[PDB]
Design an enzyme around this catalytic site. Structure first.
Site, PDB file in Angstrom:
ATOM      1  N   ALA A  32       0.439  -0.571  -0.223  1.00  0.00           N
ATOM      2  CA  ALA A  32       0.315  -0.075   0.088  1.00  0.00           C
ATOM      3  C   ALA A  32       1.546   0.833   0.198  1.00  0.00           C
ATOM      4  O   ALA A  32       1.866   1.083   0.614  1.00  0.00           O
ATOM      5  CB  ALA A  32      -0.750  -0.066   1.169  1.00  0.00           C
TER       6      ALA A  32
ATOM      7  N   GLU B 233       8.913  -2.461   4.692  1.00  0.00           N
ATOM      8  CA  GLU B 233       7.966  -1.826   5.625  1.00  0.00           C
ATOM      9  C   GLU B 233       8.492  -1.591   7.243  1.00  0.00           C
ATOM     10  O   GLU B 233       8.551  -0.408   7.700  1.00  0.00           O
ATOM     11  CB  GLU B 233       7.159  -2.942   6.481  1.00  0.00           C
ATOM     12  CG  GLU B 233       5.870  -2.790   5.380  1.00  0.00           C
ATOM     13  CD  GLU B 233       5.985  -4.725   4.644  1.00  0.00           C
ATOM     14  OE1 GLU B 233       7.238  -4.368   4.685  1.00  0.00           O
ATOM     15  OE2 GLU B 233       4.796  -5.043   4.505  1.00  0.00           O
TER      16      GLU B 233
ATOM     17  N   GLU C 126       3.710 -10.802   0.947  1.00  0.00           N
ATOM     18  CA  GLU C 126       2.279 -11.241   1.697  1.00  0.00           C
ATOM     19  C   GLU C 126       1.530 -12.262   0.361  1.00  0.00           C
ATOM     20  O   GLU C 126       0.838 -13.162   1.408  1.00  0.00           O
ATOM     21  CB  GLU C 126       1.477 -10.470   2.282  1.00  0.00           C
ATOM     22  CG  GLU C 126       2.964 -10.757   3.085  1.00  0.00           C
ATOM     23  CD  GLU C 126       2.574  -9.189   4.269  1.00  0.00           C
ATOM     24  OE1 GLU C 126       2.030  -7.949   3.868  1.00  0.00           O
ATOM     25  OE2 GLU C 126       2.660  -8.927   6.094  1.00  0.00           O
TER      26      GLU C 126
ATOM     27  N   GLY D 292       3.016  -5.812   1.098  1.00  0.00           N
ATOM     28  CA  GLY D 292       2.143  -7.302   1.024  1.00  0.00           C
ATOM     29  C   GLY D 292       2.216  -7.207  -0.425  1.00  0.00           C
ATOM     30  O   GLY D 292       1.601  -8.617  -0.522  1.00  0.00           O
TER      31      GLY D 292
END
Lengths: 255, 255
Positions: free
Chosen positions: B63, B129, B109, B106
């Site tokens: 994001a 992150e 992931e 993400g």
């Protein structure tokens, strides 16, 4: 026994699957005999290591289609055939699989049920069950996933492809690979060395490792230390430390 | 859908992230669309395999900062954005990630949420992150640790460094690596082969493997055998065994 042959070599108990005519197919009858033989050696304190191997070119294939084709959901529920596999899972004595060849389906699951695996170059491991419309039902999906992770496990389980002894070793499934004619010699030498170790120590270490696979760390350590305490009740603990101080080989007696 | 593009090729459902202009950033909106598309294919019995891939040079980035900068503890608590990721975790149909490039945060992931990962040489995986003062929140810390252990996992999670496709494969995260222009061709060939396997067998094997990752061995096997019993209620089980005996290819119908 009519499907297996058991014998002893020193403190090593050997169980040889003896149905090469059908590649040592692990039918319910064969498994029952294996369980009986293994539990017998497990109860015998004279046996410090148990070695499983197959006669002929195969270690063990899975149950034949004719036997499987007779089954249905309810018949299987009442049969509860995998309870025999659970009995193999709780054997406390050290167990080594000398995989002399094909170890497919139940065969792979039998090898995985052992503590260490010594394989021949003639060995191949796999789960062809999926190609028959079914799946492994004796721990195959569980033990393989815990050993190599879900990403790699699904590849093998979904395709039914055969894994060579070499990749099995690289993945940490097989401990060592040797040429066919050296398999038993090497396996027995290893078993012989383990037979010289403290029986109670090997037994309790194995129990701790079994918990390490399932238990959360903190609780696994809680169990581990209890076994640590218990070993100090053994005469072998006294012998091991006296031998170390005297700079001589320890002579463990399993007490 | 405005952020993804879905299509079907035989029994294979393809979901292509379609926001290359922002490197397929996995914003909450993008994730929601992915979940909707995946659940749709998961419910479609005509789809035996689902393939996820990204348009452009990236598979998927995390994001964007502008969206993340709007958040605070309470806003996030009410958003409960990771519930969408949990929905991805329970998809039963086989899922393959064709990682065509960057899979960061993400993105990594998302790939880890799939069952198998086929990667291009253009692919890189990582969790940057930490460099933003935060951490992975969609399973990254969990799935990576289970796959490669805490020692190696912390190295990657704490530094945010990028992992090449090759090391990812060596670690057992990626199933295979191929040149960029061969990625889709190879992935679709693999998916095609899996689509020829028994749908119920692939489904139940996957469920068993999911339990193997969490469940203690004994209980994982308890679940495993129940699925084994269930497969004998399928016509595909009968077909698979008849085909084997007749020495012909089985024709599974997912029933």
């Amino acid at each position: 026994f009519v499907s297996i042959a058991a014998r002893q070599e020193g403190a090593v108990g050997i169980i040889e699957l003896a149905r090469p005519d059908v590649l040592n197919a692990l039918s319910r009858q064969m498994v029952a005999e294996i369980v009986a033989a293994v539990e017998a050696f497990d109860r015998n304190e004279k046996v410090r290591v148990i070695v499983l191997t197959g006669r002929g070119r195969a270690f063990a294939a899975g149950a034949d289609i004719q036997e499987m084709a007779k089954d249905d959901p309810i018949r299987l529920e009442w049969l509860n055939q995998f309870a025999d596999w659970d009995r193999l899972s709780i054997v406390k004595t050290p167990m080594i699989a000398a995989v002399n060849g094909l170890a497919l389906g139940g065969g792979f699951e039998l090898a995985l049920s052992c503590d260490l695996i010594v394989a021949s170059s003639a060995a191949e491991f796999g789960f062809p069950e999926v190609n028959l419309g079914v799946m492994p039902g004796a721990g195959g999906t569980q033990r393989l996933t815990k050993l190599i992770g879900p990403k790699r496990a699904l590849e093998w389980l979904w395709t039914g492809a055969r894994m060579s002894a070499k990749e099995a070793e690289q993945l940490g499934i097989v401990n060592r690979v040797v040429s066919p004619e050296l398999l038993m010699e090497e396996t027995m030498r290893l078993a012989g060395r383990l037979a010289e170790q403290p029986p109670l120590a090997l037994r309790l270490i194995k129990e701790a490792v079994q918990k390490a696979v399932d238990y959360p760390l903190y609780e696994g350590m809680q169990f581990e230390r209890k076994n640590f305490y218990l070993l100090f009740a053994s005469e072998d603990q006294k012998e091991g430390m006296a031998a170390f101080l005297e700079k001589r080989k320890p002579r463990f007696q399993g007490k």
